[PDB]
């Protein structure tokens, strides 16, 4: 055993060093596990405080104080505005202050310092985030599709059949693609559709929005689209209005964010002008200048 001490001290030290360098890779994993937030704590009766489901779309924003870190820059200041049932108020604020943050925080994904984010007159500030975030359709400027089956991509949880899901998808847009699709409503989207289309992505987003049966559909203008594709998106918006009757679109495309119902400007972190009709905004001077 004296002979074999020489190659046991060596292994002890070397494996100690290897274990240290490898245990570093467990420290970093527990470091990621040390980020606890996003608690699904609904301090109410999840089935008795709201109804079966909110569907009216009369969610009037009342004194929504918005924050993300609550450190140096609030955005909203007591937005006392009401969206009437069916009144699709498409309002785009100042691109620098409240353009994207407003839509992002509409899903209770930001720090609401005070006030109450009403949903059809109900307190949605104490609603189950698992259920509340599912019955409010939205779209984003940067579309992205998770790879998998067309049914899985469009609506995995709902699992709507061909009679409902396929009919809605085909009617909304991409009828030619539907025929081209080798499988149809259950065909695998290759790598998220790396070569399918760009404007059809937003079209499928609106189709998936129509699949959740959610009355509201918060929209946003595409980063880039063709003139023909812009007309296709316009027809999709018209179809969405004629089918769901509710929408809230904050479109950065100023030369195409005019046709709407109501306008609201959030300049320097304040609501400088509100106009429930569109003609009230185009009648003024400062609001008209900022809207043209």
């Amino acid at each position: 055993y004296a002979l074999m001490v020489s190659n046991y001290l060596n292994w002890m030290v070397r494996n100690l060093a290897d274990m240290e360098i490898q245990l570093g890779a467990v420290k970093r994993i527990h470091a990621l596990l040390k980020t606890e937030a996003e608690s699904y704590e609904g301090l109410l009766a999840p089935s008795l405080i709201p109804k079966n489901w909110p569907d009216q779309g009369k969610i009037q924003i009342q004194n929504l104080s918005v924050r993300y870190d609550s450190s140096l820059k609030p955005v909203l200041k007591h937005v006392n505005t009401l969206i009437s049932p069916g009144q699709k108020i498409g309002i785009c604020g100042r691109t620098g202050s409240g353009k994207s943050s407003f839509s992002l925080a509409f899903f209770r994904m930001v720090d609401m310092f005070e006030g109450r984010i009403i949903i059809d007159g109900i307190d949605i500030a104490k609603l189950p985030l698992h259920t509340l975030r599912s019955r409010l359709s939205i779209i984003l400027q940067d579309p992205v599709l998770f790879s998998g089956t067309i049914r899985f991509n469009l609506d995995p949880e709902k699992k709507c059949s061909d009679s409902t899901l396929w009919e809605a998808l085909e009617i909304a847009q991409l009828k030619l693609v539907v025929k081209a699709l080798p499988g149809g409503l259950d065909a695998i989207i290759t790598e998220g559709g790396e070569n399918f289309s760009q404007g059809q992505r937003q079209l499928f987003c609106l189709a998936r929005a129509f699949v959740r049966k959610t009355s509201i559909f918060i929209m946003d203008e595409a980063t880039a689209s063709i003139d023909m594709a812009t007309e296709n998106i316009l027809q999709k918006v018209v179809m969405t209005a004629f089918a769901d009757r509710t929408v809230v679109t904050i479109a950065h495309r100023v030369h195409t964010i005019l046709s709407a119902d109501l306008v609201m400007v959030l300049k320097r972190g304040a609501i400088l002008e509100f106009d429930k009709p569109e003609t009230l905004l185009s009648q003024k001077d400062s609001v008209f200048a900022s809207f043209v």
Partner: protein, 183 residues
């Protein structure tokens, strides 16, 4: 100040705790018992040879045969236990990591880079699922063999431990410097 990042129990305990008590106890017991049998069979060989120089020898062979069989059996048990414990720890860590990452704020993903999350997910889980079990078994075997070897040496010659402590001090210094550089 942060150079001494060696975690004797800060991070090692987390790995063992994730495995569980019903598996940590079995693993430690199996390793200790297997090495005790190896010490016993070596000691029995010495006694049998000593009694065969001045010449019940069939009984020596019987005991020696029934000690090698126990050694082989204990080796298999220890190997299976170490591998199984590593698998369970890796599975539980991956499940917990996915569950927590699901329940996170959007601000976290917006702030922390996608590269950081992706790297410490894939690469770190692979290291903890295919390289830590083998390294732990090798480290355990090495250090337990070394303690066994020095104990046997001191048992054969009690004088040795008198000069072991100065020699061990030198060994300790070598270990410290190597680790600080090797990292």
């Amino acid at each position: 100040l942060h150079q001494r990042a060696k975690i004797p129990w800060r991070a090692c305990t987390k790995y063992l705790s994730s495995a569980g008590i019903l598996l940590l106890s079995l693993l430690v017991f199996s390793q200790l018992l297997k090495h005790m049998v190896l010490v016993a069979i070596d000691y029995w060989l010495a006694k049998w040879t000593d009694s065969a120089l001045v010449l019940d020898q069939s009984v020596y062979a019987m005991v020696f045969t029934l000690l090698c069989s126990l050694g082989i059996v204990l080796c298999l048990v220890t190997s299976v236990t170490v591998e199984w414990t590593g698998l369970k720890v890796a599975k539980r860590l991956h499940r917990s990591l996915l569950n927590r990452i699901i329940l996170a704020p959007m601000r976290f993903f917006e702030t922390t880079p996608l590269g950081s999350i992706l790297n410490r997910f894939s690469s770190d889980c692979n290291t903890i699922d295919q390289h830590i079990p083998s390294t732990l078994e090798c480290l355990s075997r090495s250090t337990l063999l070394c303690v066994s070897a020095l104990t046997v040496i001191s048992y054969v010659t009690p004088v040795f431990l008198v000069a072991l402590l100065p020699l061990a001090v030198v060994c300790y210094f070598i270990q410290k410097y190597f680790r600080v550089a090797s990292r």
